[PDB]
Amino acid sequence: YKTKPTHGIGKYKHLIKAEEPVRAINLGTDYEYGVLNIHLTAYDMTLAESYAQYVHNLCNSLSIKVEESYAMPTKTIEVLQLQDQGSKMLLDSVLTTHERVVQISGLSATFAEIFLEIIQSSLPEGVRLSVKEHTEEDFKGRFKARPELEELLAKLK
Amino acid sequence: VELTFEETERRALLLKKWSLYKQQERKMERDTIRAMLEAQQEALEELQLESP
Amino acid sequence: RRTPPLGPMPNSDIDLSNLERLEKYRSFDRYRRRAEQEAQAPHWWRTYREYFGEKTDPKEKIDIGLPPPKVSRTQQLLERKQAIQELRANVEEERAARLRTASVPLDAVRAEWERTCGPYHKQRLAEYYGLYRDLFH
Amino acid sequence: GSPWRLLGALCLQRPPVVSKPLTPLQEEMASLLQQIEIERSLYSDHELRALDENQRLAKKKADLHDEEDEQDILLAQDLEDMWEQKFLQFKLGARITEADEKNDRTSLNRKLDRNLVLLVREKFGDQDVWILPQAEWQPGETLRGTAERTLATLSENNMEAKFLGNAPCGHYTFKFPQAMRTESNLGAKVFFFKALLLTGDFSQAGNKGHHVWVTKDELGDYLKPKYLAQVRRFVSDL
Amino acid sequence: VARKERGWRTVFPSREFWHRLRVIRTQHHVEALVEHQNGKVVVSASTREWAIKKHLYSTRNVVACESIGRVLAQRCLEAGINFMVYQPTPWEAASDSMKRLQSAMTEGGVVLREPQRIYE
RNA sequence: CAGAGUGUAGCUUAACACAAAGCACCCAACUUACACUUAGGAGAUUUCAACUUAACUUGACCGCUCUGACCA
């Protein structure tokens, strides 16, 4: 009851993050970095996924918030080689590029040196590590292209 | 093809040894992060006293 | 009209500034474990235990039994650790537990139970039946 | 000013070039994972090709019912032979190079599976002491910038380094001997900054007496016991 | 004929019982308790006891959980406790350790369902 | 080097004895991954003499963090 000293004992929503419904990019301060995308490029699908899991678990143990873990579209490139005593290119092998991205935020400037040192020391063979600041273009690169929108935009140009 | 009793026993013991091996790897990595963090924080404190 | 609480309100120790960085329960069991401990703690408000719990005497119950036996903890612990190491060193024991075929001898367990935890469990069991309440007030 | 002398040290490190060899325990685990992967995997096109080719041979020998003559020129097993022959001809790079054999602790081509830390020899008070590269701080310059300037002051080097962060990775404070110890110059405060060696190497003018590259395990041979302890904190050997 | 504490339908677990089987599993030990509705523990069986620990290779596996049920069922018969209730969470009930423990209690003679109260 | 402090595994003012506890941690399955869940794995009283008590009391002892010496 309101007048009783036990008023408000049942309150619970002040302990819960307000969830009242794409995502705004939060730039970091002078001492903390903003949203960061940790790209993992490799020719082996297992290596890319396994290291992304390792990075995701590493951040949790380091109390670093992980915004989102997702996979970039697979790139398939044909590999052709020139035949001996010939001028014709013949297909040799097919290579698929797999990219895994782990999105983190709130990284401290002083702690960035330690975090980058640990991840680069554990990088598997054949895996490329690239850490970039999150931008709108990178997020928009995960969506299908819209030729119909482009065609209408060309008329306006 | 069904695995033999000896084959299953070998894998089970290997997995048990694998758990301890990965635990020691985490301890070495966790201590490595702690060692770097303690040194960096101590260095910053010394630097602040010398020249803010 | 408001009245200040008679004591510390629940969830007052929670820091709402760093709510995002605070570790959550994330599971039903972890919340339940904390909930059970919180319920047992005394409170300044009206509770179920106030109206239904047994009104035990605040003074400690008088012990009128034989003195407890003297046991060397250091020697007892060393022997028990040696026994465990011998048991775990057996390959068959590890295989039996891994295959979920091992079992304990009830007769051997109870014989050791009578010498270590028997007298204490009997006191608790007799307390539940109220023998001490009637025989010795 | 201050009685202590500000010094900015550079902890230049060479990242490993090759992957570390697997431990004997990891070799057992690696084989098991490969064995498990094959067991739970479906038949591949190469495997399906071999199975069908074996059946065609049976369908050509047991009964003369095959209605095709050309079939396939090369069998799956025969195709594996060509791949095997090419692999034998190709020669892989030497993981252990001539530097390891000769124990040439100056070149960067040694211990490609380990981490190398740059060490230089500097003479103080007619005494040669092995320390990390360092320079004295100057007005109008950040502490990290002094470490960057230290790289440019090396003996004919075109190395490129990638500094990580601005905060120092460690510090080392020492006092001068009482013979020359004065209130104006009580001692020095060295600050370490780590960087990654991307590309470049020293010229062939001076190699043995100028700089050495050693791992953390052998780092104690050159550093003083008090100086070694501080360096071993921010330098990892993972 | 005794009153069971009915109600508490909006919370968990229910209080409508006389004795209940409560099983506590920790990181290194497994404990099973039979306590009355008032909160008094009647009988108990824990892997911390040297009587049970000395015969177990591990005190945190299915064998330990099954062994505790066998020991507790013997103590329940010696204590006169024949009927009790079990209130598991959905994941605990589907767990293999609890199924073995429930089987041990049933094979020991203890019924995991109390008879209904006689109102007339 | 000396002096000063400190003493259960990562944390804990867990340890009356019936007992070295609780949590954190690691592998596997599930999960894109995390998380939950299930099923597993590894752990400690620095050591010793003192009602023989004693992780606890006290000494020694070993280790450990600090103040200086020492230092390029």
Quick one: CA torsion of D229, D230, D234, D236, rounded to 10 degrees? -20
Nearest to D16 by CA among D207, D237, D208, D232: D237
| Domain tally, chain E | 1
Describe chain E by its helix, strand, coil percentages, rounded to 5.
Answer: 30, 20, 50
Furthest CA-CA distance within chain E: 52
* Approach to solving: cryo-EM
- For β-strands A66-82 and D211-214, DSSP reports them as unpaired
Residue E19 contacts residue C102 (beta carbons within 8 Å): no
D170-175 and D160-163 strand pairing:
unpaired
CB A36 within 8 A of CB A102: no
| B40/D189 touch (CB, cutoff 8 Å), yes or no | no
Say how far apart CA A28 and CA A26 lie, in whole Å. Answer: 6
DSSP, collapsed to helix, strand or coil, labels residue A24 as: coil
**Closest-approach nucleotide to residue A102, Cα vs C1':** F33
E88 touches strand F (CB under 7 A): no
Q: Does A92 touch chain B (CB under 8 A)?
A: no
Is A144 a domain residue?
no
Inter-chain CB proximity C10 and A2 less than 8 Å: no
Q: Which two tokens stand for residue A75?
A: 């790139």
Binding partners of C (≥3 Cβ pairs within 8 A): A, E
Tokens of C133: 């309440």
What is the signed CA dihedral for D85, D88, D93, D95, rounded to 10 degrees?
140
For nucleotide F16, give the residue with the nearest CA to its C1'.
Answer: C68
Is the shortest CB-to-strand distance from B26 to strand F under 7 Å?
Answer: yes
b/e sequence D62-84, b meaning 16+ C-beta within 10 Å: eeeeeeeeeeeeebbeeeeeeee
Query: Is A109 within 8 Å of chain D by CB?
Result: yes
Residue E77 burial by Cβ neighbours in a 10 Å radius (0-12, 13-18, 19+): middle
Region of A116 (left: φ > 0; alpha: ψ -120 to 50; beta: rest) is alpha
DSSP string covering C62-91, please? PP-SPPPPP--HHHHHHHHHHHHHHHHH-H
The Cα-based distances of E7 to D68, E3, E16, E65 in angstroms read 82, 12, 7, 31
Burial A110-141 (b: 16+ CB within 10 A, else e): bbbbbbbbbbeebbbeebebebeebeeebbee
Among all strands, which nt has the closest C1' to C120 (CA)? F18
CB contact set of A106 (below 8 Å; sequence gap of 6+): A28, A32, A33, A64, A65
The reply to whether D191 touches chain B by the CB within 8 Å rule is yes
- Phi/psi region, residue D40 (left: phi>0; alpha: psi -120 to 50; beta: rest), is alpha
* Domain presence at residue A109: yes
Beta bridge partners of D192: D9, D170
User: Could you tell me the residue range of the domain that residue E72 belongs to?
Assistant: 1-119
CB–CB contact E57 C88 (8 Å):
yes
Q: B19 burial class (0-12, 13-18, 19+ CB within 10 angstroms)?
A: exposed
Distance CA D234, CA D204 (A): 31
Give me the resolution in angstroms, 1 decimal. Answer: 2.9
Q: Give the separation between CA D163 and CA D215, rounded to whole angstroms.
A: 20
Query: DSSP strand E in chain D: where?
Result: 4-14, 116-123, 128-131, 134-136, 160-163, 170-175, 187-199, 211-214
- Nearest chain C Cα to A64, which residue? C21
Chains near D (3 or more Cβ pairs under 8 Å): A, B
Does strand F come within 7 Å of the CB of D124?
yes
Chain A residues with CB-CB distance to D197 below 8 A? none
Strand F at less than 7 A from CB of C97 = yes
Rg value, chain C, Cα: 24
Residue E74 contacts strand F, CB under 7 A? no
Those residues with Cβ within 8 angstroms of residue D234's Cβ, 6 or more apart along the chain or in another chain: B35, B36, B39, B40, D11, D169, D170, D192, D194
Where are the alpha helices (H) located in chain E, listed in sequence order?
50-53, 62-78, 90-94, 96-107
Return the sign of the alpha-carbon dihedral for residues A58, A64, A68, A72: negative
CA–CA gap between residue A85 and residue A89 (Å, rounded): 11
Beta bridge partner(s), residue E33: E22, E44
- Cβ contact D189:D164 at 8 Å: no
- DSSP helix/strand/coil, D108: coil
Radius of gyration of chain E (CA): 15
- For residue A3, report the phi and psi dihedrals to the nearest 5 degrees: -75, -20
- Is A113 within 8 Å of B29 when comparing Cβ atoms? no
What's the CA dihedral at A49, A51, A53, A59 to 10 degrees?
A: -150
**Helical spans, DSSP H, in chain C:** 28-40, 48-52, 73-89, 91-98, 106-116, 118-129, 131-135
Q: Which of D95, D111, D131 is nearest to D214 (CA)?
A: D111
Q: How many residues does chain A have?
A: 157
What's the domain count of chain A? 1
Give the tokens for residue E17. Answer: 């019982």
**Residue type present at position D69:** D
Placement of tokens 């539940």 in the chain: C128
E13 prior amide bond cis, ω within 30: yes
Nearest to A131 by CA among A32, A36, A29, A26: A36
Do chains C and A touch by CB distance (3+ pairs < 8 Å)?
A: yes
Residue with tokens 């007619």: D126
Instruction: Using a threshold of 3 CB pairs under 8 A, tell whether chains E and D touch.
Output: no
Beta bridge partners, D171, equal: D191
Query: Quick one: closest CA in A to D166, which residue?
Result: A110
Q: Name the strand (E) or helix (H) holding A147.
A: helix A147-156
CA of E30 to C1' of F56 (A): 28
- Count Cβ atoms within 10 A of the Cβ of residue A3 and give its class: 0-12 exposed, 13-18 middle, 19 or more buried: exposed
Quick check: A61 contacting B, CB < 8 Å? Answer: yes
Touching check for A129 and chain D: CB below 8 Å?
A: no
Distance CA D33, CA A53 (A): 18
Residue A157 lies in a domain: no
Written as six digits, the tokens of D62 are 């047991």
For residue E48, give both structure tokens. 């911390």
Cα D213 from chain centre: 11
Expressed as residue numbers, the domain containing A5 is: 1-135
Kind of pairing, strands D116-123 and D211-214?
antiparallel
Q: Which residues, at least 6 apart from D53, have a Cβ–Cβ distance to it below 8 Å?
A: D72, D75, D76, D77
Q: Which of the nucleotides in strand F have any atom less than 7 Å away from a protein CB atom?
A: 17-28, 32-43, 45, 51-56, 69-72
- Does the CA dihedral C42-C44-C50-C54 come out positive or negative? positive
What gap in Å lies between CA A13 and CA A16, rounded to an integer?
A: 5
Answer yes or no: is A68 within a domain.
yes
Where do we find the tokens 């700089």?
D211
**Chain D residues near residue B18 by CB distance under 8 angstroms:** 25, 29
Closest nt to C100 (CA→C1')?
A: F39
Q: Which of A59, A41, A38, A157 is nearest to A111 (CA)?
A: A59
**Angstrom distance (rounded) from CA A107 to CA D213:** 32
Instruction: Taking each helix axis as running N to C, give the angle between helix C91-98 and helix C73-89, from 0 to 180 degrees, rounded to the nearest 10.
Output: 80
